[PDB]
Each structure stands twice: as structure tokens, then as C-alpha cells.
Amino acid sequence: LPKPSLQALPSSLVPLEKPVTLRCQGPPGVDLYRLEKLSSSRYQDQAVLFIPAMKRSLAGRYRCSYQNGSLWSLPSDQLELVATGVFAKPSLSAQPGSGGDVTLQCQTRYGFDQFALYKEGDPERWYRASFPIITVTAAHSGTYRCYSFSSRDPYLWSAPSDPLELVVT
Amino acid sequence: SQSGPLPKPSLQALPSSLVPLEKPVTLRCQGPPGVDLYRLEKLSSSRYQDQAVLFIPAMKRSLAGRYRCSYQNGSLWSLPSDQLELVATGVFAKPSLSAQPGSGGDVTLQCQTRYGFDQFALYKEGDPERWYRASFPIITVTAAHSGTYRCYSFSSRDPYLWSAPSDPLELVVTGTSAA
Amino acid sequence: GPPGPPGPPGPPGPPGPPGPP
Amino acid sequence: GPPGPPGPPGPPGPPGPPGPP
Amino acid sequence: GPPGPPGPPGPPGPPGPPGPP
Ligand SMILES: *[C@@H]1O[C@H](CO)[C@@H](O)[C@H](O)[C@H]1NC(C)=O
Ligand SMILES: *[C@@H]1O[C@H](CO)[C@@H](O)[C@H](O)[C@H]1NC(C)=O
Ligand SMILES: [Cl-]
Structure with a gap:
């Protein structure tokens, strides 16, 4: 099941206290999205993470995948989320x-x-x-x-x- | 209000998790006293029950594998137990x-x-x-x-x-006796 | 007589996705 | 009377398989 | 009337652990 994209908007370089939205995107109409941060092992069952104010602890490597039927997709390209x-x-x-x-x-x-x-x-x-x-x-x-x-x-x-x-x- | 997730129960195979074919074994989930409902499951299958105990009177090849359990307090599910590895010998x-x-x-x-x-x-x-x-x-x-x-x-x-x-x-x- | 009792809780969720390399 | 309501949701599923090398 | 049907499945489990080196 082909990999989704993971984008940080407006940028993956995010100054402290400024906003960023992580968006996981695969084919339309799928059952469920899974978005995760690798270092902390904290994750969500949602395609979108809005970070209203960037923190040092939110910087790091993120990836995502989606589920359709019982099957999982290949993971997204690693998203490198940097706090500037x-x-x-x-x-x-x-x-x-x-x-x-x-x-x-x-x-x-x-x-x-x-x-x-x-x-x-x-x-x-x-x-x-x-x-x-x-x-x-x-x-x-x-x-x-x-x-x-x-x-x-x-x-x-x-x-x-x-x-x-x-x-x- | 609640400070965190409900702690995991223990899952235990008695007398042992190494069970010869046709010999008995009891899997017991154990949480804190006053639990509403237990859930015992076998991984990589849709087999599960809503009861703390599973008595297997005679071990089979199909019953070997990985097991876990959790419990409920109201609608809220506890953390899963450590995975029990049930072996058929x-x-x-x-x-x-x-x-x-x-x-x-x-x-x-x-x-x-x-x-x-x-x-x-x-x-x-x-x-x-x-x-x-x-x-x-x-x-x-x-x-x-x-x-x-x-x-x-x-x-x-x-x-x-x-x-x-x-x-x-x-x-x-x-040279390692207690004498 | 009244309505029925609520059903039992649903099945365990599926696996998570395969981990990172 | 009519049938009872569907039960509450199941527990979260188990860990995914480990990642490749 | 009869008791209700089972509830829906639980959410998917945590991601798999990281692979070996
Ligand atoms: C998801 O699965 C259903 C069949 O179970 C299918 O109808 C649908 O097209 C699938 N979508 C994708 C993107 O795989
Ligand atoms: C269940 O939760 C209630 C509070 O919501 C608490 O008073 C009770 O002791 C708990 N018991 C268990 C076994 O979790
Ligand atoms: Cl830039």
C-alpha cells in the first residue's frame, strides 16, 4: 500500500513560538491515518498536527502512514522538524x-x-x-x-x- | 479527574508457560481488586474472551503463541499486560x-x-x-x-x-560446595 | 417490557504499523 | 421491548511488528 | 428484549519498535 506524503507548513524550519502544521496525505477516503514522532514514541490517529507555538521538545523526526482495511501503508519519508x-x-x-x-x-x-x-x-x-x-x-x-x-x-x-x-x- | 492510564495487569500461566501437548494450563489475568471487566486475548488472531481466566484442559498446537490481557474501569481501558509466551512442548x-x-x-x-x-x-x-x-x-x-x-x-x-x-x-x- | 442490556465491549484493535528501520 | 444498544469500544490493539535493518 | 451486539473495534496499537542495526 503506497506511501503517503508528510509536509510541514509553512516550513519544516520553525522559529520558537511560531506556528507549523504537519499534514499526512495519502489516497482519498482511507480509514485511518497514523502520525508519529520517533524519539518520544508519542503518536496520534489523525492526519493533521497543528503546533500553534514551536517548542524545543517538539523538534525531531516525524513520519506517518495510513491504514485501509486491516493493512498498513509503507511509512512516509521522514520529516525533519527543526526549531530555529x-x-x-x-x-x-x-x-x-x-x-x-x-x-x-x-x-x-x-x-x-x-x-x-x-x-x-x-x-x-x-x-x-x-x-x-x-x-x-x-x-x-x-x-x-x-x-x-x-x-x-x-x-x-x-x-x-x-x-x-x-x-x- | 484522573492522573494517568490505569496500570497494567499481570498475565500468568500456571503451572507453567511451557505446556506439553495434552497437559493442562491456566492463564490468569490479575488487576487491582474491584475491576469491572477483564479482557484476555491471543495475538495475531481474533480470539479473545471477556474473562480473567482461560483454563486450557489439554494443550494444543493451535493454542500456542502470544497472549495478553487488559481490564476496564467503566469505559476506560487499562494498559496492556506484558505479553505471555505460551509454548507447546x-x-x-x-x-x-x-x-x-x-x-x-x-x-x-x-x-x-x-x-x-x-x-x-x-x-x-x-x-x-x-x-x-x-x-x-x-x-x-x-x-x-x-x-x-x-x-x-x-x-x-x-x-x-x-x-x-x-x-x-x-x-x-x-570446589563450590557449602562445606 | 423495557429495552435490552448494552452489548459487550468490542474486539481488540488491530496491530500498529511496522516500526522504523 | 427493542434490542439493547451496541457496547463500548474495544481496547487499543497490540504493538506493530519490528522495523527492518 | 435481547442484549445488544458487540461494540466497534478498539483503535490501532502503538507503532512497532525500531529495527536492529
Ligand atoms: C480501501 O479498501 C476498500 C475495500 O475494502 C476499497 O473499496 C477502497 O478503494 C480502498 N482504498 C484504497 C485507497 O486502497
Ligand atoms: C476505578 O475508578 C474510580 C474513579 O473513577 C476509582 O474510585 C476506583 O477505585 C477505580 N478502581 C479500579 C480497580 O480501577
Ligand atoms: Cl526556509
């Missing part, structure tokens, strides 16, 4: 790197050992690193932002940096 | 239990059968029974206590349908 604004924003700078590359430095006061950088748009481009140094091969002009976090709590992220407006030649 | 001819001692605190025990079973279970009598498990017949027990050892063979296909128990083997580790 848990820490002070980092500050983002950019320099030329090796060859046709741009090196973005995601600066942070704390000892963080994970960094995620993105360019606004459709589609978004994402880049990950453990060093606060993210090289980007053939980068595009755009509005870049970085998030810093710890690998011991990988779903609690900082506030996003201020945007860096990059132009590349 | 004497379903295959018994194995032959030997032991080669290995000079390093441990003992290797052969639970041999003219059969191609991929699961073996070895136990020692005495209050806490000391159980041991394996995918192969040769099981190695470390720091083995003196006592009466028997073994069982079964197939993972029907993991609640066990052989008859082997004839006992008396292990005596020397």
Missing part, C-alpha cells in the same frame, strides 16, 4: 575561495560543530559543514543565510544570520 | 543433551537432533532458572552454575512449537 531561534544568530561573511568558488564564513560565539547555509529562491540551494567554512562551487548571486547548531541536539538551530547579498564574477 | 521427539567441558571456566553443551532445527534453548533448574539461546546446537555457557540442565529444539517458523525436553544432564562444577 534556539541560539543567537551567527554572522555570515563571504570571500573568494579556490578557483571558481566562494567561501562563506558562518561566525559564531559558542562552540557549534554544524552549519547550514542557503540561497533564497525556487529551488533553494542548501550546503552543510562541520567547520564554520562552507565552500560553494560555481555559486550564484543571491540572498544567503546561515544557521549554526550542535550535533548533540541536531534539531535545535540558531536564529538565521542576517542576509548576505552576494554577487559573483 | 512435546511437538517433536526430544533431543539428546551432552556436554564437553572446556578448560576456561565454561562448558560447551550439544543439543543434538536428527532434525534441521535452527533454534535451541537450554535451561538449568533452580529458582531463577538460567536460560540460554542459540541459532546453532553447540551452546557455550560461561561461569556455569552446578545443576540440572535440559534442552529444547524448535524451528523459527513456529517458534512456540517446541520439542519434548531432553533427558536431564547433571553438571557439577567442583
